[PDB]
Homo-oligomer: A and B are copies of this chain.
């Protein structure tokens, strides 16, 4: 297993960019510190600058649900670019993707495209505050909602990975209009509403968390949140930037039947390109400029290249037996991992819903970030490296969810379980 080229490239990288990467988690800091540099990706695999091929489970952090470099997506894009990549004025494609999104996600009656999930979350917070006229927002420990000021407090992703705390460039004057509660603690939320009456704009959360590892909500949690916010004239916002189009076509809101007032989408909606969106009830979206006073803009928003990738990705997911296939192969891989762990003497817990799974090195059960924190990270680090050497690419962090795509085959799942066996028979 040679990584000569990855090593020299990442070495040179550190002198040019902060930590040598464009996003923190790619530095491999909580798993050894030696990242491999990619050259190309195809279907369910990835290739090294050294020639090594891996079966990918990161899937570029959500976007590749259809598989890397889908033939029909890049051909649609090769055709689109001969007409220019960015116009700066409206184009017909915005209208089609927009209509597709309205039909797809329940709560969305009107949309606004942006360039990333971060931008969509910045916008949705401002909108929920503007619509209500209140300033307090209730967020949950372990939920990532983009690298924004108001939300860098017990967030997810790298925050809930390398033990990053609150603030990072944001003052106490920003992270003070944001109340925090433990994920799944319906009672703690009620407390915050009774403790700060008439001043909570709303609650925002990942309906299913993937940024503190995979954590599913309990029996009547989401239903609880919908009712309590209602009783107080507060807005319920679902950050489905990761869950959207993966858990189901209409996301977690469709799968579990709880409808929020606004939702945010990103990742899969751009099909592999920088795109995001925020939408919800009509009367609320009416406040967004130019239709309203709340300002939010973006030079590259709605660009045709992005709209093209977006539309092709949704046409492919709308086909017969898409999610059934994801639930099927992902259940086999998840159950298979937990079985191998049990027979090798390793304590573990996990699960999956459609093409999103989780696996933790602790008996659990995991109900929140604190529970997630009791995992043996030293074992995870060794597990991750071993899997890497066996040709399987896993998220370099215990606090990230795993992903599956329509290009993963039954055989691909069988080889992964085979590697997991050879590996867990060490540690």
Residues of A within 8 A of B (CB): 6, 9-10, 12-13, 15-27, 29, 35-42, 46, 49, 58-64, 68-69, 74, 77-78, 81-92, 94-95, 98-99, 102, 110-119, 122-123, 125-131, 135, 147-150, 152, 155, 157-159, 162, 164-165, 167-171, 173-174, 176-177, 266-267, 270, 272-275, 285-303, 305-306, 309
The answer to whether B59 touches A115 (Cβ under 8 A) is no
The residue on B at minimum CB distance from A164 is B295
Question: How many copies altogether?
Answer: 2
Inter-chain CA distance A88–B287, complex, in Å, is 35
Which chain B residue lies CB-closest to A295? Answer: B168
17 contacts between A and B (CB under 8 A): A9-B95, A13-B94, A13-B95, A16-B95, A18-B289, A23-B298, A23-B302, A29-B290, A38-B88, A46-B87, A64-B86, A69-B82, A69-B84, A128-B169, A135-B173, A149-B150, A158-B289
A9 to B: closest C-beta gap in Å: 6
* Contact indicator B98/A17 (Cβ below 8 Å): yes
Q: Do residues B168 and A149 form an inter-chain contact, with CB atoms below 8 A?
A: no
Q: Are A135 and B171 in contact (CB under 8 A)?
A: yes
How far does the alpha carbon of A295 sit from the alpha carbon of B23 in the complex, in Å?
Answer: 9
Query: Are A290 and B110 touching (Cβ within 8 A)?
Result: no
Q: A37-B91, A115-B115, A298-B118 are in contact. Are A18 and B86 (CB under 8 A)?
A: no
**Complexed CA–CA distance, A49 and B93 (Å):** 12
CB <8 Å contact, A118 and B117: no
- How far apart sit A37 and B170, CA to CA, in the bound complex (Å)? 40
